[PDB]
Amino acid sequence: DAPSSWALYFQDGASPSYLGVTHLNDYLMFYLTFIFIGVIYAICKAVIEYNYNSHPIAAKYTTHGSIVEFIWTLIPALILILVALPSFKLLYLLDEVQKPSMTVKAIGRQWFWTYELNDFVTNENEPVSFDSYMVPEEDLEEGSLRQLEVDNRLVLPIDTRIRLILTSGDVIHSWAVPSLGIKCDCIPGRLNQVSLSIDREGLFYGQCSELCGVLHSSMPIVVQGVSLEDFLAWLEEN
Amino acid sequence: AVGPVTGMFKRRIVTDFSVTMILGTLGACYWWFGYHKPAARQREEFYVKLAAEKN
Amino acid sequence: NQRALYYFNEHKWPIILGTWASTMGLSLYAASRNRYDTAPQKLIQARMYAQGVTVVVLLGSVYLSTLAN
Amino acid sequence: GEAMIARPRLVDLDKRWGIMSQEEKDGLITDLYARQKQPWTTLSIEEKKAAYWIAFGEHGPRAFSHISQKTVFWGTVAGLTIGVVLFGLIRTQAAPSPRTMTREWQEKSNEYMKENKINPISGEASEGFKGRGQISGGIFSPSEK
Amino acid sequence: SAPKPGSTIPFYINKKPLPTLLYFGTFGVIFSIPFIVVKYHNRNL
Amino acid sequence: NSWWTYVNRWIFSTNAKDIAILYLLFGLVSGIIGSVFSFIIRMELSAPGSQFLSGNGQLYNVAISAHGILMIFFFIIPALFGAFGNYLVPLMIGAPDVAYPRVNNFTFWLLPPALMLLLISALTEEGPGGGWTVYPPLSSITSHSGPAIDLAILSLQLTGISSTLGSVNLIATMINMRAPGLSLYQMPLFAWAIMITSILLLLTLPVLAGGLFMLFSDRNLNTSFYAPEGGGDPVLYQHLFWFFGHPEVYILIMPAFGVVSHIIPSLAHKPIFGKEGMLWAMLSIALLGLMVWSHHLFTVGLDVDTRAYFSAATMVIAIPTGIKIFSWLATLTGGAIQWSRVPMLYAIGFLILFTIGGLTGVILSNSVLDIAFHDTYFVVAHFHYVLSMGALFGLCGAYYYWSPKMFGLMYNETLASIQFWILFIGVNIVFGPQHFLGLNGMPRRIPDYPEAFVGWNFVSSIGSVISILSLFLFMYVMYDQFTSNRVVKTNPYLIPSYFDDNVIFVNEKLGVAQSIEWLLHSPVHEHAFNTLPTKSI
Amino acid sequence: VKAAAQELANAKEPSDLIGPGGRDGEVPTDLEQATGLERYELLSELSGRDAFDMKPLDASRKGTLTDPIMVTSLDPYRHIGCTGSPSGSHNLIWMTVYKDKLRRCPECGSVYKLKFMGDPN
Amino acid sequence: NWLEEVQAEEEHAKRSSEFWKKVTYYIGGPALILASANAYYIYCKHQEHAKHVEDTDPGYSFENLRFKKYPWGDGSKTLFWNDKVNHL
Amino acid sequence: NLSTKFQGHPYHIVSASPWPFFLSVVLFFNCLAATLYLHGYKHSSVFFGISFLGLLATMYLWFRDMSTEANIHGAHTKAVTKGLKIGFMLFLISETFLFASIFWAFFHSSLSPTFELGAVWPPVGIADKTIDPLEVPLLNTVILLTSGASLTYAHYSLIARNRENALKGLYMTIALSFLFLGGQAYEYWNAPFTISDSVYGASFYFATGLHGIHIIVGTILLLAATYNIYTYHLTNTHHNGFECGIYYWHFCDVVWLFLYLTIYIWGS
Amino acid sequence: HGVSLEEINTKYNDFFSNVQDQFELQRGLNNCFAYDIVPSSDVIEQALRAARRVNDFPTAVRIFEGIKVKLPTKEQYQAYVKELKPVCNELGIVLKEDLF
Amino acid sequence: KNTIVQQQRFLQSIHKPTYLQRPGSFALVYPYYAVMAGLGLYSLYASGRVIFGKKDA
Amino acid sequence: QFTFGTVGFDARFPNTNQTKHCFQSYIDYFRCIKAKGEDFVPCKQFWHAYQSLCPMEWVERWDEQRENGTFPAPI
Ligand code: HEA
Ligand code: HEA
Ligand SMILES: CCCCCCCCCCCCCCCC(=O)OC[C@H](COP(=O)(O)OCCN)OC(=O)CCCCCCCCCCCCCCC
Ligand SMILES: CCCCCCCCCCCCCCCC(=O)OC[C@H](COP(=O)(O)OCCN)OC(=O)CCCCCCCCCCCCCCC
Ligand code: CUA
Ligand SMILES: [Ca+2]
Ligand SMILES: [Cu+2]
Ligand SMILES: [Mg+2]
Ligand SMILES: [Zn+2]
């Protein structure tokens, strides 16, 4: 959910949209590692075994080939098809539309996010909206994560489809959370749509991924999944 | 007359190709059966343990 | 008829592009049968003929489209 | 050329060939060519040695520049050492580090991430988690005292 | 116009004693321009 | 007076081969500044917090933007496509000189003023603060309210003029002024690569010119092309720019393909394997480089079908390129190899690093996977591992291969090998850990980062330091080459065959070569080719 | 044709290549207002000969020590690219045919000899 | 030989040039005057002017944008601005 | 033997040419002066004008040398007069690709109108204050179409060794080009929408100004050609400077046809 | 794709049978030991006889040097030298490994 | 009115570079050099003004 | 008290882009209330459709524009 020290591979996440990306990446790496090792070994071996002091006589009359070239052109095609089939099945499965039960808005202002929910508008007449500001270093609570903590963090329920609508007001921003495998661009004038579904009950961190000027490094994103009762209590508070 | 001797380039090329293919297959198989499957097992075990604990 | 006439103005752009291309090709093919005419000289006449035919058909289409009553 | 050449004119020609004059070289090669038309069974062993050295020698067209790989290795090692030392020397001319780069704060963060259940599979909130977590260690965690 | 090139056409002259200072000095200015930019951007803070 | 002769020779010149040296030296001069800017960037980005720049963000943005522009527009293209595209093509195809002798000089002399304009821009109140690809909304008058980003666009327009006007006379030269008996299909592979790069430049540059002028007018003449308030779409600029952005990442690389193709067989004593295959692979890559440009816009939110197609037409490029690699491998198996020579060292080092970069590129071609790597350090690792390892290494190999012909002096070998090894190790260590940093999810273009991305950056800074020592060593060896007085033969890369005698070779087999440029004297004459060479019909 | 050949024959220096000139009221033709190299090419083409030497190499036949292939040149050398027996035999190899010396191909053994159709000094 | 080819080429050029002169003098002429007359007629057909409408849905939020003031004139005027047809 | 006193190859050898070093400097002056002027720096309007005059002067001085070398030195042989056509064809291709960027911008802004424009391409309000394509534009296109016939007549008359007709045809072509430019300027000065008005105007003016510049260049080329003819310089079989302007004129004609077909009729 | 390798052997035997030029012999040998095939003992017989005819002892030794280089195993080279020993004694040529 | 041949012959007696070959060409060259020198001298000062943002007043 | 309910899938706008959804919902709702009557219950549905998507920073601008009569739409 948060970066570790000296980490190598992905970080633990919880989302159906995140369980596919990592699996596809492992599948693709399975094919790519073999090619990498084979090519490097062949390149290294072709020189040790044919160096000048061992093979003075060159085979200058063999600069042709008609069966080797066909295999060269064919085998990579098969590899590409094999890798491609899941990469399309997963894409089209993921892009389809479910039946969302809630909606949120994540307007990306200049150097702070503005979250809004208007679904619950009723005789209460209090649509909920707030702004997320990065906590300064001096104000950090003991043990907190520097450069990744916010005063107000988005709160959502788990095991419930959510539809995120993203836009901006000043420049091009990007809402990005790797733990949930979400990355979309907020462009001023158009509403981008994304699907989201929390799975565990934890905290998830992220940062904006499109430079917006001088404070591109101080727009953290924090999502907290809580049970239904906790979400209802939190909503009633606001 | 000891007769002509030929068929040297093919032997060397075939040997190099075979060893390269063996090494590549070994590496890929180790990657797929040494990292991915244990990770999937751990994730499934954790999720089932959480679900059981929920009760 | 009154149906093909409505079809004409229902699709007036593809017919214009098609007739321009057809005039270009027809003129280019017809002119490729002489001796003292360099290739650019041959292409220039095709350009002129195509432009003229396109202009006349554009005027015709503009006149025809008026029947929107 | 039916008479053999004197022995001293051909002994260890490899080293002597380095310092000579064009006249002597031309005379020697032409004499060898003249004496090579007789049946080879009558040629002295030293004459054959000299002829082979002159023909398929290690001079003239085939005399390549030698590179001592030992020197290359030692030069690369020295360059790497100088680079590391220079980086270390210009590292101590920077601003003071933040207040969250202390081993105590790292330990507090490691303990705090377990309460909130962050990375609860193979991270700081796992079951056993005998790993490091957020303590990068070394000079990156100068435990305050 | 049929001369034999002298085996040198480098856009300048190089000797040991004096020109070596100029060759390696001009290298310093190009190496230092960005430092000048950085220093000039941090004077009105 | 020597002043008049000097001015006539070097400023009012019209000799094709006497302008290439100017291109090379200017490219090197710009590359020095680019490398120093990169060194500043990497020293700042070592440890968490504000280390060296006193808590400034605009300065860092200026640094990255200037570094990218300088090292992609003023260093590789002029020092590789122009420096070696003018000196060798007329010689290689067997022509007296370029078709238009003074248009080439005019094309060259547009660079110094452009560099001066860019420096003045970087020295203004704020400077370019939108990266090497300025984007409309962040780079409009609202944010950058000064005459800082206007100059940086005029400089790019001037460079585009120079490139698109110097890429026309090359085509007009290789079409009309070939040696008798030699056909287009039989030209050397390097000339074919230069032709293809010229075609791509000629086709794509004006689109970027138009887009950049639209952006420039949007700040001063009150147009509303990229303003969502007036009725425009800020995403149009992305389309217009990246329609040229990709066809420019093939222009950069292809001359390296040609250089390696001409370096391998020469020092391997074996003809290239399947020349027609390589020619057709190059043509296919060139053709397919124009139909895939929007794969840089996967997260913008295009409809599903467009993403699916643009992801299907990006993997295909991996078929032809791959062929080329195999061919070079097929060339090494069988022939005598002299691996100690510096050009061979660079040629071999090119293959491994470029193939790693290309595989990493294939990783992030799928639309599904790109969401986990877009605008992270994985992209930085990929494109650096391709550019600063396949283009820079190709450039260094070409220089160390053809320097004795241009200048007529032989450099030192031990120092060249030491420099190569230092550069190899340093760049590998620099760009290794960035892969892990990107994988873990650390964005790019941030002077500061979270607390857990420290180890890998601290490791990479050391290599970033070492590479500068490599550059210093290269400068010293280049200097020592000019003041050593080491004559070089006509064709230094000719050695007697296995059975060739030491006198028969001397007096009956000299003056032979597999390319024309190795027949002329070492400091090639001025008015060469009084009578054109002939080839069997 | 005869007039062009006669005019070309009787001329000492390149400065003597000037046409008779045209007349006012009508456009002038190339035969009367061409000077320098252009007039040289025009006159040589009209006369039936070749102005410049751009004839490809003689692929047919194989050279021999007693019957070499003649390569004409205006200079004491001329670079030639040998391909051997009917074009396509062996790989292309470039070489320079020195004056008064026989250039023998290192692969197919063909022999070429220079013909100095030019001014010694 | 040369004379015959030159004569034939000149004859062909003369015939084609005469044809094109006839085309441009007998086809391209009447159309020009007809088009000019049509333009004059349509222009006269609506010579009413009175193009002074104010407050009728003014601005619309996408007309007369001022991001940066112009350098010429006072600072808020275009190049070919006209005070008889263009209103603010 | 006169052959030994000449060169072996037909290509051209040039010397000196100090103009390339000055054109780049003048361009630098122009760019800097424009940047200064647009932001309103004192004492920076005369700079721009003097820089433009310098640019024109240097370009004229350059183009004088080519005429001197081709009409006196006699260095334009049978082969050197083919690269001068291949280069022009390549330049025309480059301009053709440049001209498509503005069309792409127009199409992207038109096919999918934004909500603020009312969802209809012609922005609400601006629809009723457009220009009739059955007006001055039709006269302009007819003029540009009938100019080509005059140009072809002039060229063919020149080939057939006739002087009066060639000059007459060039006169008519230049006059018609001037009339077209005047009509375009008149239409510019009587439009009810400025450049900074939505995107429709910002695209219309942007697409028309480039064509205006191109046609001005073509007219200057034709003027140079006619002046060369009048001096008894161009021959009947070697008139490269004329065949190099014919192509430009006809390319401009085709581009105008496409522009009028798209912008005036469709996008309105 | 053309001629096999057996016809190559016969062709090179025929070529080596008749040659009277040092350059010819050297280029023929250069092009022969590059075809992946080491000729039979008859071809070496003819090559050595030709070398004797043109009076070039160094080539007479270099032929055996190349035979040794191209062969993959020591036993085959030993058999080769054994087969051609009587000619070596007759002509007086000395193998490289024995000279020094 | 056809002096083409006469001047063609005359102008070939001058060996000066092609941009000075025609008689009376210095008048159109040296003033141009002076103008360019003045423009460059002003350009340096203009760039200096731009760097230190300031408009004359 | 709180019930989860929002706008479901719509065939007209299946793509990722949804810029036109809010605009269409707004226009349709206002046309709806213009006809029939303000008390029409089904009309109210469009209300929610145009409140769950529009960022609420545009709805105020549209209302302010519609006040005077500068709204760039028929209604
Ligand atoms: C010379 C420069 C260069 C070259 C050659 C390439 C080559 C490739 N590039 Fe890249 N790229 C860049 C320079 C380059 N690139 C730059 C500068 C950026 C960042 C721009 C920015 O900052 O906005 C970038 C960004 C970039 C992105 C954008 C990612 C994102 O931002 O989200 C993508 C997406 O697919 C991509 C893919 C590729 C592919 C598929 C190739 C292919 O051409 C690679 C071909 C090579 C191989 C395929 C390996 C060799 C082949 C074999 C060994 C055969 C076997 C292979 C298989 C079976 C697959 N690169
Ligand atoms: C050719 C292109 C090129 C080259 C060579 C380089 C070289 C280097 N680059 Fe960079 N870089 C880019 C193109 C290049 N780069 C681009 C396009 C971006 C994106 C900018 C943006 O986001 O807008 C970028 C961004 C970029 C970043 C990301 C910054 C950020 O996002 O915050 C970093 C981080 O360290 C970096 C570091 C380096 C380092 C340490 C080197 C060097 O140390 C590598 C080693 C090279 C040398 C030491 C040079 C040696 C030179 C010679 C030996 C001369 C040879 C000459 C002859 C033979 C004539 N560069
Ligand atoms: C020049 C090279 C360009 C190369 C790239 C191609 C770009 C397209 C072509 C050029 C732009 C044409 C615009 C339309 C022309 C027109 O006629 O504009 C018409 C409009 C006026 O209309 P109005 O609203 O008054 O009408 C009202 C009707 N009632 O004038 C303008 O507002 C200003 C346009 C000219 C501004 C010139 C500024 C130049 C700055 C320097 C440029 C860089 C020089 C250095 C280059 C190396
Ligand atoms: C925005 C895009 C446009 C930018 C402007 C580009 C302008 C330059 C375009 C190139 C034109 C010349 C190419 C052909 C040269 C050639 O081939 O000349 C070859 C001929 C040879 O004569 P001959 O062999 O016929 O004589 C035969 C005797 N027996 O010499 C000439 O006639 C020189 C002609 C000079 C005039 C050309 C037009 C100059 C440009 C006008 C516009 C200037 C303002 C531009 C403002 C931006
Ligand atoms: Cu918002 Cu970076
Ligand atoms: Ca930092
Ligand atoms: Cu790309
Ligand atoms: Mg992005
Ligand atoms: Zn041969």
Author numbering:
A (entry chain B): 10 to 247
B (entry chain I): 2 to 56
C (entry chain L): 97 to 165
D (entry chain E): 39 to 183
E (entry chain H): 22 to 66
F (entry chain A): 2 to 538
G (entry chain D): 39 to 159
H (entry chain K): 38 to 125
The article reads:
The final O2-reducing complex of the respiratory chain, cytochrome c oxidase, also known as complex IV (CIV), receives electrons from soluble cytochrome c (cyt. c), which is reduced by the cyt. bc1 complex, CIII. In CIV electrons are first transferred to the primary electron acceptor, CuA, and then consecutively to heme a, and the heme a3-CuB catalytic site where oxygen is reduced to water. In addition, each electron transfer to the catalytic site is linked to pumping of one proton across the membrane, from the n to the positive (p) side, i.e. the intermembrane space in mitochondria. Subunit I harbors redox cofactors heme a, heme a3 and CuB, subunit II binds the primary electron acceptor, CuA.
Cryo-EM of the S. pombe CIV purified in GDN yielded a map with an overall resolution of 3.4 Å. The map allowed construction of an atomic model containing Cox1-9, Cox12 and Cox13, with overall structural similarity to CIV of the S. cerevisiae CIII-CIV supercomplexes. As with other canonical CIVs, we identified a covalent link between His247 and Tyr251 at the catalytic site. In the current S. pombe structural model three lipids were modelled in Cox3 as phosphatidylethanolamine (PE) based on map interpretation and similarities with previous structures. We identified a density attributed to two TM α-helices in the S. pombe CIV at the same position as in the S. cerevisiae CIII2CIV1/2 supercomplex. This density could be convincingly modelled as the two HIG1 TM α-helices of Rcf2. Density for an α-helix near Cox12 at the p-side of the membrane that we attribute to Rcf2 is also seen in S. pombe CIV. However, it lacks sufficient resolution to identify the amino acid side chains and was therefore modelled as a polyalanine peptide. The S. pombe CIV structural model shows specific interactions of the fully conserved, second R (R143) and Q (Q147), of the QRRQ motif with Asp254 of Cox3, which is a highly conserved residue in CIV. Furthermore, the data suggest that the C-terminal HIG1 domain of Rcf2 does not only associate with the CIII-CIV supercomplex, but also with monomeric CIV.
